[PDB]
Each structure stands twice: as structure tokens, then as C-alpha cells.
Design a binder for this molecule. Structure first.
Ligand SMILES: N=C(N)c1cc(-c2cccc(NC(=O)C3(Oc4ccc(Cl)cc4)CCCC3)c2)cs1
Ligand SMILES: N=C(N)c1cc(-c2cccc(NC(=O)C3(Oc4ccc(Cl)cc4)CCCC3)c2)cs1
Lengths: 236, 5, 236, 5
């Protein structure tokens, strides 16, 4: 690790600076270095890690979608042969995306998840594990595609089971997990009905628990609830 | 695309 | 060069794909590979090169400015010592920026400028040379700062002299060169009066030549003329 | 910042 010689606290400080500078590749590298110090992550540190890699892989996914769209058009009946270049470059971006996903999954497996005992950490990491297998699933086409999908499903399911036992229905981690698992059902698992049911039930159970919250907790929970509603509006 | 967080 | 084994035409094709995917680091790498094939660049290819590196260095400059601002605040009277991390990370971004600038300047020196005989290519490359020395000047503080500034000035001046002899006053390359040389005067050379004079004279001479243009050439020229006016409005 | 192209 090229960050092995830097202090943990300095890595966290520089991740925050990288965020302010919108340098998310740097942010992710700094947070990878911090994870590799071997200590558990605090709540803020977990979110720094997630924000960094979500931004990096989000950009890769957007680029992949553009290139995949161009590639599909090049393969329509009537197109002029473009040669191998569109496929090659889509494959290049795809391989870089898979590499980032494998890196994050590696951090979760070595050894963030196994040391995470509190619900807020364990559900958060298992959600990430489902998310990064979901991104692998988005580009998967080979002998392993069903297994990648099932790895995402299994991680999300363990996270769901813990969240329903250990967190209130308005907990923003629980809500964000349900939001993303619902998208998994709709976009990956070809289960739109499950996606819609999960989003609606999550929204309604949260609604009924808002009365217990402070003004600031209310703002956090209703923000994610609105994303659930947004998706439901998209899908119905 | 749908919203995720 | 990691692009040495790829066909020139494939590099150009992939630069265009990278642009569509907003992958400007890739775009720049592809166009560096194309330059290193040793052939002169067409008009479209010159603009692909410039677009790529302008976007890469533009992001670095934005990040550097954020970090430099944080660093200056950390050094105000009353601040809590943050340790070396802000300076270190600003230096990291700065060094990466200098590396990109040196790469572009290297391509211009080996051997784009010396083979560029037509005004549209030679003025374009000398403008770039002034631009990338200007970006080096923005971060320079050492024994070499005056020399970096003078290298920018000298490149812009040679480009200006050629453009006034060989191009009409509405030529968009001539206009863009004058726009940027004017910013050099204002922001780098501490010569706001020269900056304002150059922008105004360029604008007025272009105005008087618009009558010679087609509708499409008019659109191109007036676009840059509006940027000259925008800067003049900022400065007066 | 001022405009450049
Ligand atoms: N960016 C940083 N420097 C830091 C960010 C945080 C932080 C701590 C707690 C919650 C959030 N919430 C979030 O970011 C959003 O909501 C969720 C909800 C659920 C999940 Cl599982 C993930 C995100 C993401 C979309 C809107 C808010 C952020 C600490 S530091
Ligand atoms: N992006 C691509 N795939 C390609 C772009 C081009 C192309 C060819 C000729 C002119 C322009 N003009 C430009 O981009 C703007 O104007 C100038 C003007 C002067 C200078 Cl010196 C530089 C830019 C930049 C700001 C607005 C327009 C673009 C070909 S291909």
C-alpha cells in the first residue's frame, strides 16, 4: 500500500480535503489507506469511505453506459463497421470498474464486515457489499453472472434482516438499504413487483415512525423517504 | 435511472 | 509510451469516445499517443488534443485553488495548527498539475511546433504553449517564476505576431489567443491596463470584420467576442 | 475567474 507510511489521522484529514476539492479518486485512495491500518471505522469514517468510492464508481458506471449505448448502436442492422475500438474501450472502462468494485469488496472482506458488530456498522457494510456486487452485476455477462447477482442479493438480505431486528423503520441506513435493495430487484433481478412492494412498505413503515423523531432526524429520514417515493413514481 | 444512496 | 502499439486512427477514435464518456484523462492519454506517432495533426485532431488537456488541467487548477484557499486560511492569525497535511496535499495536486503541463509542453516542443508552418496550426500550438506556461505560472513561487512568466509571454507574443499578419481579425483562433493573452496580462503579469486594451482592441477589430462572414463563421466569431466582452465587464 | 478558451 502506497499509503502505508502515512498516519491514519492524516489519511482521514486528506480524504476530507480531497472531498472539498472534488478529487474523489484521491479521496478513495486515502480512505483505502485508512481502512488498511486495521482499526474499525467510526460513523464519519465509514461515510467518507462510501462517499469516495460511490463517486468513483458512479463516474465509471456513467461512462460505461455511454460506451455500451454507442456499442449497441454500432451493432444494429445497417451500421457501418467501426472496427474493434468501441468494444475495446468499453471493455477497458468495464475492467477498471470491476477493479474498483473488487477493491471495495476486498476491504469489506478484509476485514471490515467480520469486525462489525453494531447494527449501524454491520448493516452499512453489508449494504455496500450488495451495492458493489450490484455494480458488478450491471456489467456481467459470463458464467458467473447469476452468482454475482446472488452475492448481491445475499448481502442485501443479511443487511435487511439485521436492520429490521435492530433499527427503527426511520433509521436512514435502514431506509437507504431498502432503497437500494429495491433498485436491485427492479434493475438486476427482474423483480419489479418486489421492488415496488419493498419501496412502498418501507415508506409506509417509516411514515408511521416519524412522530418519534427530532426535527433534525425527521429531515434525514424524510429525505430518503422522498427518494423511495421518487422511484415509486418512476415505476407506477 | 432510479435513485440510490 | 503505453499507446505505442495502438493504431493512430484507433487512438483518435478512442479519444472521441472518451470525450463522449467525459473521460478526459483517457482522452488526453489517447491524444498523447496520437501525437507521438510523429505525424502532423489535422485541425480536428489539434482540437481533440487541446480539449482533452484543457479539461484535465482545468480540474487540477480548480482543486489546487480550493486547497490553496484552505491552506491560506490555516495560516491566518488565530487558526488552529492543522499540521502539514493541507500543505502536503496541495503540493501533491500541484506536482500532478505541473506534470500534466510539462507533458503538454513536451509534446509541443517534440515536435508539434517545429513542424507547424501554416498559421492555423502554428498559432494554435503557440497559444497552447502560452496557456500551459500560464498554468505553471499560477502555482509558481521559486527562483524560476519570472522565467516561467516570460516563457508564457514569449509564446503568446509569437502567436500574436503571426496571427496579426496571417489571419483576419475574426478568426476564432486569433480571437481565442487574444482572449487568453489578455487574461495572462490581467492575472499573471499584473498588467490590467494591457489586458483591457488588448480585449477591447481585439473586440472592436473583430466587430468591423464580421460583415465578411457567413452565418456559421459569424456564430463562431461572435461567441468568442462575447467572452472578450464578459471579461471587459468583469474588469471595468 | 475570467473566461479563457
Ligand atoms: N460526506 C462526508 N464528508 C460525510 C457524510 C456523513 C454522513 C453521515 C451520516 C449520514 C449521511 N447521509 C448521506 O450521505 C445521504 O444519506 C445516506 C443514507 C443512508 C446511507 Cl446507507 C448512505 C447515505 C446520501 C444521500 C443524502 C444523504 C452522511 C458524515 S461525513
Ligand atoms: N471537441 C471536439 N471533439 C472538437 C472540437 C473542434 C473545434 C474545431 C474548431 C474550433 C473549435 N472551437 C472551440 O472549441 C471553442 O472555441 C475555441 C476558439 C479558439 C481556440 Cl484557439 C480554441 C477554442 C472553445 C470554446 C467554444 C468554442 C472546436 C473540432 S473537434
Amino acid at each position: 500500500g502506497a499509503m502505508g507510511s502515512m498516519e491514519r489521522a492524516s489519511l482521514i484529514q486528506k480524504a476530507k480535503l480531497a472531498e472539498q476539492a472534488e478529487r474523489y479518486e484521491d479521496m478513495a485512495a486515502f480512505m483505502k489507506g485508512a481502512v488498511e491500518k486495521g482499526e474499525e471505522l467510526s460513523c464519519e469514517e465509514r461515510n467518507l469511505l462510501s462517499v469516495a468510492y460511490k463517486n468513483v464508481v458512479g463516474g465509471q458506471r456513467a461512462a460505461w453506459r455511454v460506451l455500451s449505448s454507442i456499442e449497441q448502436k454500432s451493432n444494429e442492422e445497417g451500421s457501418e463497421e467501426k472496427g474493434p475500438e468501441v468494444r475495446e474501450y468499453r471493455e477497458k472502462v468495464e475492467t477498471e470498474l470491476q477493479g474498483v468494485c473488487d477493491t471495495v469488496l476486498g476491504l469489506l472482506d478484509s476485514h471490515l464486515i467480520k469486525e462489525a458488530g453494531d447494527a449501524e456498522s454491520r448493516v452499512f457494510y453489508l449494504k455496500m457489499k450488495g451495492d458493489y456486487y450490484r455494480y458488478l452485476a450491471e456489467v456481467a455477462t459470463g458464467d458467473d453472472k447469476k452468482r454475482i447477482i446472488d452475492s448481491a442479493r445475499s448481502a442485501y438480505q443479511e443487511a435487511m434482516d439485521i436492520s429490521k431486528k435492530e433499527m427503527p423503520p426511520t433509521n436512514p441506513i435502514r431506509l437507504g438499504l431498502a432503497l437500494n435493495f429495491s433498485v436491485f430487484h427492479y434493475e438486476i433481478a427482474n423483480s419489479p413487483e418486489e421492488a415496488i412492494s419493498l419501496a412502498k412498505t418501507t415508506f409506509d413503515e417509516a411514515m408511521a415512525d416519524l412522530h418519534t423523531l427530532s426535527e433534525d432526524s425527521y429531515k434525514d429520514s424524510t429525505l430518503i423517504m422522498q427518494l423511495l417515493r421518487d422511484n415509486l413514481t418512476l415505476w407506477t | 435511472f432510479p435513485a440510490t444512496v
